[PDB]
Amino acid sequence: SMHSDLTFCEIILMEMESHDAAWPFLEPVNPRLVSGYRRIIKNPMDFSTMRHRLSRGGYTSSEEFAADALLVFDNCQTFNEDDSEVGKAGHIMRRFFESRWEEFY
Ligand SMILES: CCc1ccc2[nH]c(-c3cnnn3C)nc2c1
């Protein structure tokens, strides 16, 4: 299970999930709602997958956790136009994440 040294990552992820701009990223991009996603995006990532991976010990380091957070935002900017609702949400969430991360790094 999660090592206590990563509790700060657990908190950041919780805070991300609570943000209104997080709605596109809470669960895996859902083929019932979004077509052609995995055709383009080879490494999907979302906050629920991160939350479960973190809790079960699937992140050894904060670097691995942050890499998955950045994958959420990188995938979003690959798939979505910057002026789309989901594209804008991704940029909000990247800034929110980086601002919390930079309190530690
Ligand atoms: C469950 C509600 C919902 C509906 C549409 C969505 N679209 C995206 C998304 C994420 N990254 N790219 N897209 C297009 N998340 C969504 C969530």
Side-chain angles (χ1 to χ4, degrees):
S1 69
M2 189 194 74
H3 193 279
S4 64
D5 289 348
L6 301 184
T7 304
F8 80 104
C9 292
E10 190 180 35
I11 290 164
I12 289 174
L13 181 57
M14 176 190 71
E15 290 182 336
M16 287 200 293
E17 290 175 329
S18 288
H19 203 297
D20 256 5
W23 69 264
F25 316 114
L26 296 178
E27 295 179 89
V29 175
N30 183 347
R32 302 177 192 85
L33 304 178
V34 177
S35 81
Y37 188 78
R38 289 162 182 75
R39 187 178 80 81
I40 296 154
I41 297 300
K42 301 299 112 160
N43 300 106
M45 188 50 54
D46 65 278
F47 296 154
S48 284
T49 297
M50 291 178 62
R51 183 175 77 250
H52 295 147
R53 189 162 301 165
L54 180 60
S55 72
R56 68 175 194 260
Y59 296 121
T60 297
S61 69
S62 63
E63 178 106 16
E64 294 171 356
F65 166 85
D68 272 354
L70 295 173
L71 184 56
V72 177
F73 313 136
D74 289 346
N75 288 342
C76 181
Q77 74 184 357
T78 301
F79 191 77
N80 300 280
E81 290 287 314
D82 285 337
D83 66 1
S84 69
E85 293 305 304
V86 171
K88 292 192 301 198
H91 293 304
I92 291 164
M93 293 310 306
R94 188 191 292 273
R95 199 282 322 169
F96 183 94
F97 171 75
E98 298 198 302
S99 283
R100 275 149 184 77
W101 200 250
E102 103 174 276
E103 303 189 348
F104 300 87
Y105 302 92

PDB file of all heavy atoms in Angstrom, residues 23-24 29 33-34 37 79-80 86, ligand 1:
ATOM      1  N   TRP A  23     -13.562  17.854 -13.943  1.00  0.00           N
ATOM      2  CA  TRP A  23     -14.598  16.926 -14.391  1.00  0.00           C
ATOM      3  C   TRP A  23     -14.202  16.074 -15.599  1.00  0.00           C
ATOM      4  O   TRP A  23     -14.596  14.898 -15.638  1.00  0.00           O
ATOM      5  CB  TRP A  23     -15.947  17.649 -14.587  1.00  0.00           C
ATOM      6  CG  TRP A  23     -15.993  18.626 -15.755  1.00  0.00           C
ATOM      7  CD1 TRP A  23     -15.802  19.975 -15.708  1.00  0.00           C
ATOM      8  CD2 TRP A  23     -16.218  18.308 -17.140  1.00  0.00           C
ATOM      9  NE1 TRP A  23     -15.890  20.513 -16.963  1.00  0.00           N
ATOM     10  CE2 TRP A  23     -16.131  19.512 -17.867  1.00  0.00           C
ATOM     11  CE3 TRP A  23     -16.451  17.126 -17.830  1.00  0.00           C
ATOM     12  CZ2 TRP A  23     -16.313  19.568 -19.257  1.00  0.00           C
ATOM     13  CZ3 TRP A  23     -16.629  17.180 -19.205  1.00  0.00           C
ATOM     14  CH2 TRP A  23     -16.554  18.393 -19.900  1.00  0.00           C
ATOM     15  N   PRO A  24     -13.459  16.565 -16.598  1.00  0.00           N
ATOM     16  CA  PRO A  24     -13.141  15.698 -17.742  1.00  0.00           C
ATOM     17  C   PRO A  24     -12.176  14.590 -17.403  1.00  0.00           C
ATOM     18  O   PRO A  24     -12.051  13.653 -18.200  1.00  0.00           O
ATOM     19  CB  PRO A  24     -12.509  16.660 -18.762  1.00  0.00           C
ATOM     20  CG  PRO A  24     -12.927  18.008 -18.341  1.00  0.00           C
ATOM     21  CD  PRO A  24     -12.973  17.930 -16.827  1.00  0.00           C
ATOM     22  N   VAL A  29     -11.225   8.365 -19.889  1.00  0.00           N
ATOM     23  CA  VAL A  29     -12.033   8.838 -21.007  1.00  0.00           C
ATOM     24  C   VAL A  29     -12.897   7.690 -21.474  1.00  0.00           C
ATOM     25  O   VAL A  29     -12.410   6.592 -21.757  1.00  0.00           O
ATOM     26  CB  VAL A  29     -11.160   9.408 -22.130  1.00  0.00           C
ATOM     27  CG1 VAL A  29     -12.026   9.774 -23.322  1.00  0.00           C
ATOM     28  CG2 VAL A  29     -10.439  10.640 -21.626  1.00  0.00           C
ATOM     29  N   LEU A  33     -18.982   8.014 -24.269  1.00  0.00           N
ATOM     30  CA  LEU A  33     -19.182   9.452 -24.374  1.00  0.00           C
ATOM     31  C   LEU A  33     -18.234  10.157 -25.332  1.00  0.00           C
ATOM     32  O   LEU A  33     -18.545  11.266 -25.783  1.00  0.00           O
ATOM     33  CB  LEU A  33     -19.012  10.089 -22.989  1.00  0.00           C
ATOM     34  CG  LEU A  33     -19.907   9.519 -21.887  1.00  0.00           C
ATOM     35  CD1 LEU A  33     -19.614  10.180 -20.547  1.00  0.00           C
ATOM     36  CD2 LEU A  33     -21.364   9.677 -22.262  1.00  0.00           C
ATOM     37  N   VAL A  34     -17.087   9.569 -25.638  1.00  0.00           N
ATOM     38  CA  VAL A  34     -16.048  10.221 -26.428  1.00  0.00           C
ATOM     39  C   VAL A  34     -15.533   9.186 -27.402  1.00  0.00           C
ATOM     40  O   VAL A  34     -15.038   8.136 -26.982  1.00  0.00           O
ATOM     41  CB  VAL A  34     -14.879  10.699 -25.545  1.00  0.00           C
ATOM     42  CG1 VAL A  34     -13.798  11.300 -26.405  1.00  0.00           C
ATOM     43  CG2 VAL A  34     -15.350  11.694 -24.500  1.00  0.00           C
ATOM     44  N   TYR A  37     -10.809   8.051 -29.026  1.00  0.00           N
ATOM     45  CA  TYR A  37      -9.822   8.558 -28.083  1.00  0.00           C
ATOM     46  C   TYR A  37      -8.554   7.709 -28.062  1.00  0.00           C
ATOM     47  O   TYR A  37      -7.459   8.206 -28.365  1.00  0.00           O
ATOM     48  CB  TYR A  37     -10.433   8.683 -26.688  1.00  0.00           C
ATOM     49  CG  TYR A  37      -9.493   9.378 -25.727  1.00  0.00           C
ATOM     50  CD1 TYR A  37      -9.337  10.760 -25.756  1.00  0.00           C
ATOM     51  CD2 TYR A  37      -8.711   8.648 -24.824  1.00  0.00           C
ATOM     52  CE1 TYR A  37      -8.464  11.405 -24.872  1.00  0.00           C
ATOM     53  CE2 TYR A  37      -7.837   9.278 -23.960  1.00  0.00           C
ATOM     54  CZ  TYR A  37      -7.706  10.658 -24.001  1.00  0.00           C
ATOM     55  OH  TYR A  37      -6.833  11.287 -23.146  1.00  0.00           O
ATOM     56  N   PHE A  79      -5.361  15.638 -27.543  1.00  0.00           N
ATOM     57  CA  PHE A  79      -6.643  15.271 -28.123  1.00  0.00           C
ATOM     58  C   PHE A  79      -7.570  16.446 -28.379  1.00  0.00           C
ATOM     59  O   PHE A  79      -8.406  16.374 -29.297  1.00  0.00           O
ATOM     60  CB  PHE A  79      -7.356  14.313 -27.179  1.00  0.00           C
ATOM     61  CG  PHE A  79      -8.555  13.664 -27.792  1.00  0.00           C
ATOM     62  CD1 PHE A  79      -8.393  12.628 -28.695  1.00  0.00           C
ATOM     63  CD2 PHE A  79      -9.845  14.070 -27.472  1.00  0.00           C
ATOM     64  CE1 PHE A  79      -9.490  11.998 -29.267  1.00  0.00           C
ATOM     65  CE2 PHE A  79     -10.946  13.451 -28.064  1.00  0.00           C
ATOM     66  CZ  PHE A  79     -10.760  12.416 -28.965  1.00  0.00           C
ATOM     67  N   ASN A  80      -7.477  17.502 -27.579  1.00  0.00           N
ATOM     68  CA  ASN A  80      -8.475  18.558 -27.559  1.00  0.00           C
ATOM     69  C   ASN A  80      -7.891  19.866 -28.051  1.00  0.00           C
ATOM     70  O   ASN A  80      -6.739  20.192 -27.765  1.00  0.00           O
ATOM     71  CB  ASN A  80      -9.021  18.767 -26.155  1.00  0.00           C
ATOM     72  CG  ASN A  80      -9.665  17.525 -25.604  1.00  0.00           C
ATOM     73  OD1 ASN A  80     -10.805  17.214 -25.920  1.00  0.00           O
ATOM     74  ND2 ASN A  80      -8.934  16.807 -24.775  1.00  0.00           N
ATOM     75  N   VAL A  86     -12.928  21.119 -22.789  1.00  0.00           N
ATOM     76  CA  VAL A  86     -12.016  20.171 -22.156  1.00  0.00           C
ATOM     77  C   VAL A  86     -10.576  20.649 -22.283  1.00  0.00           C
ATOM     78  O   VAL A  86      -9.788  20.525 -21.340  1.00  0.00           O
ATOM     79  CB  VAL A  86     -12.246  18.760 -22.723  1.00  0.00           C
ATOM     80  CG1 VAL A  86     -11.165  17.807 -22.254  1.00  0.00           C
ATOM     81  CG2 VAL A  86     -13.610  18.266 -22.291  1.00  0.00           C
TER      82      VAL A  86
HETATM   83  C1  LIG B   1     -18.177  11.791 -17.563  1.00  0.00           C
HETATM   84  C2  LIG B   1     -18.370  13.188 -18.159  1.00  0.00           C
HETATM   85  C3  LIG B   1     -17.470  13.497 -19.364  1.00  0.00           C
HETATM   86  C4  LIG B   1     -17.994  13.791 -20.622  1.00  0.00           C
HETATM   87  C5  LIG B   1     -17.154  14.073 -21.690  1.00  0.00           C
HETATM   88  C6  LIG B   1     -15.764  14.041 -21.487  1.00  0.00           C
HETATM   89  N1  LIG B   1     -14.763  14.272 -22.356  1.00  0.00           N
HETATM   90  C7  LIG B   1     -13.631  14.132 -21.678  1.00  0.00           C
HETATM   91  C8  LIG B   1     -12.241  14.265 -22.237  1.00  0.00           C
HETATM   92  C9  LIG B   1     -11.088  14.104 -21.488  1.00  0.00           C
HETATM   93  N2  LIG B   1     -10.066  14.268 -22.300  1.00  0.00           N
HETATM   94  N3  LIG B   1     -10.544  14.472 -23.540  1.00  0.00           N
HETATM   95  N4  LIG B   1     -11.879  14.478 -23.481  1.00  0.00           N
HETATM   96  C10 LIG B   1     -12.686  14.708 -24.654  1.00  0.00           C
HETATM   97  N5  LIG B   1     -13.911  13.807 -20.404  1.00  0.00           N
HETATM   98  C11 LIG B   1     -15.248  13.761 -20.270  1.00  0.00           C
HETATM   99  C12 LIG B   1     -16.098  13.468 -19.182  1.00  0.00           C
END
